[PDB]
């Protein structure tokens, strides 16, 4: 792991000491190589997980998030290359440094053994995101968005610190291997239900729940792009990972402190997908879809079954890839029209007949297409929920219907129709922004060809 996060640190001098004309290239290529060397930790020939030190470990839940975080960086970096091309070189390099800092801190999170390491890094991730959203957003609502996105997190996370501190004072170590093998059943009192809530309602904010999600549209809609990629791809999964790690020390309270959150997730998933059915803003449509997806992950982690954790991991990775892809696809048009309004430009597939295939595949990923790690996750958590209660499929099916609807409606009212003939500024395409979608989709196909990796702790 050290061999993954030291080169990631060396990517920063590589930015600052290189020419202005040979800085995107070098850092992009070397980031791809970091992604390559982040495959050694998929060499798990055994059941025992990979401990490299007291600091760092890597389980089959860590490794996909690690690899995806190392893999997104070149994509963020190339997507961020048309805008801030007319920016001063120092400003460019500051953007690069923030993205690399995100990479490093997120790898450290997913590789951490203790919960306090994970805490300080889970919170250090806020500073790059806030800077990216605020200094490089295009609109004026970015400031309120940053405030929301920061303070929801901090409100949720201060109780988390208090609970971790309590657990240290009670057990002594706060390490995840030892909390696994030494976990006392809880006495089922209010003093422990508050502990459950303090441990959970930091991650549940970040995933997010439907009661608390207003930070995610305001941020996705206003972050330039790369912030949106990350905020859709791994910052939401940074809560699911934490829940999967911390739930082991909360049994048996999860059997009854989970009803409200499963229920909120399910109903609010339906609510969010219905919103996606009727939404003027494309970058908000993607965001509400992300809420409607992560709600299933919430319910799944609450059920704590093998099928459920499995499907949660699958849906995590799949949603991350396809959501980053859809944000790229919307940015591709926003870099020309400079409008997020979707019904503005609605008759493409004449000018962009190849991007319109990436659109289609991105949507089919989004809706439940079977030979895909999206439907595998959605199906397995549907099966877990049916085992839990047979009356949940009534809601999952409504979601499936609406999720076909808003995705196909997006495709239709953006591509299909009559071309907006008043748009002379529809430049043909960028090889860069075609390679982007290819690099988002080719992993989906590969992982569908081999989902033995993309499962989690339980398979």
């Amino acid at each position: 792991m050290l061999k993954i996060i030291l080169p990631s640190l060396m990517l920063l001098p590589l930015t600052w000491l290189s020419s202005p004309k040979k800085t995107w290239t070098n850092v992009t290529s070397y980031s791809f190589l970091i992604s390559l060397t982040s495959l050694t930790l998929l060499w798990q020939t055994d059941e025992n997980y990979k401990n490299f030190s007291n600091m760092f470990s890597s389980d089959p839940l860590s490794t996909p998030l690690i690899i995806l975080t190392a893999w997104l960086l070149p994509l963020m970096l190339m997507a961020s290359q048309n805008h801030l091309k007319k920016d001063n070189n120092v400003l460019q390099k500051l953007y690069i440094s923030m993205l690399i800092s995100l990479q490093i801190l997120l790898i450290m999170t997913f590789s951490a053994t203790e919960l306090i390491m994970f805490y300080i890094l889970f919170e250090a991730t806020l500073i790059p995101t806030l800077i990216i959203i605020t200094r490089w957003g295009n609109q004026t609502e970015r400031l309120n968005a940053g405030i929301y996105f920061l303070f929801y997190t901090l409100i949720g996370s201060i109780p988390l610190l208090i609970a971790l501190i309590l657990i240290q004072n009670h057990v002594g170590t706060l390490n995840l291997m030892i909390l696994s093998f030494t976990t006392h059943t809880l006495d089922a009192s209010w003093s422990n239900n508050l502990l459950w809530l303090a441990c959970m309602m930091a991650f549940l904010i970040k995933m997010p729940l439907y009661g608390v999600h207003l930070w995610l549209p305001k941020a996705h809609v206003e972050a330039p792009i790369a912030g949106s990629m990350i905020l859709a791809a791994i910052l939401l999964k940074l809560g699911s990972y934490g829940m999967i790690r911390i739930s082991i020390i909360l049994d048996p309270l999860t059997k009854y402190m989970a009803y409200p959150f499963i229920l909120l997730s399910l109903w609010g998933m339906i609510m969010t997908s219905s919103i996606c059915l009727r939404q003027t803003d494309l970058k908000s449509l993607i965001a509400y879809s992300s809420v409607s997806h992560m709600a299933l992950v919430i319910a799944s982690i609450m059920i704590q079954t093998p099928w459920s954790f499995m499907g949660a991991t699958m849906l995590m990775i799949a949603h991350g890839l396809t959501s980053s892809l859809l944000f790229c696809l919307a940015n591709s048009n926003y870099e020309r029209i400079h409008s997020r309004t979707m019904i503005m430009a609605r008759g493409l597939q004449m000018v962009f007949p190849l991007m319109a295939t990436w659109w289609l595949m991105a949507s089919l990923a989004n809706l439940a297409l079977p030979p895909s790690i999206n439907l595998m996750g959605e199906l397995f958590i549907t099966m877990s929920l049916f085992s839990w209660s047979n009356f949940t499929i009534i809601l999952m099916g409504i979601n499936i219907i609406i999720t076909g609807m808003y995705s196909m409606y997006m495709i239709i009212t953006t591509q299909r129709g009559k071309l907006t003939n008043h748009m002379i500024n529809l430049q043909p395409s960028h090889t860069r922004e075609l390679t982007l979608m290819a690099l988002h989709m080719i992993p989906l196909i590969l992982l569908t060809t081999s989902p033995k990796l993309i499962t989690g702790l339980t398979m």
């Binding site: 030190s53 600091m55 053994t113 203790e114 240290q168 706060l174």
Partner: protein, 57 residues
């Protein structure tokens, strides 16, 4: 034959004796409580360094 003392002869200590003994323990002092013992040892490095949160060394 009583001679008057000169200027500074009555202003000095004069070394008496007596059949009396010394007073053993004036002030009627009680026994003193015993101080807390000192930890005898050649001190070593801290066991696993700082037991702080997650720092190794």
């Amino acid at each position: 034959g009583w001679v008057r003392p000169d200027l500074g002869q009555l202003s000095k200590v004069t070394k008496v004796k007596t059949d009396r003994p010394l007073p053993e323990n004036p002030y009627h002092s009680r026994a003193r409580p015993e101080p807390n013992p000192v930890i005898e040892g050649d001190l070593k490095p801290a066991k696993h360094g700082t037991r702080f949160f997650f720092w190794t060394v």
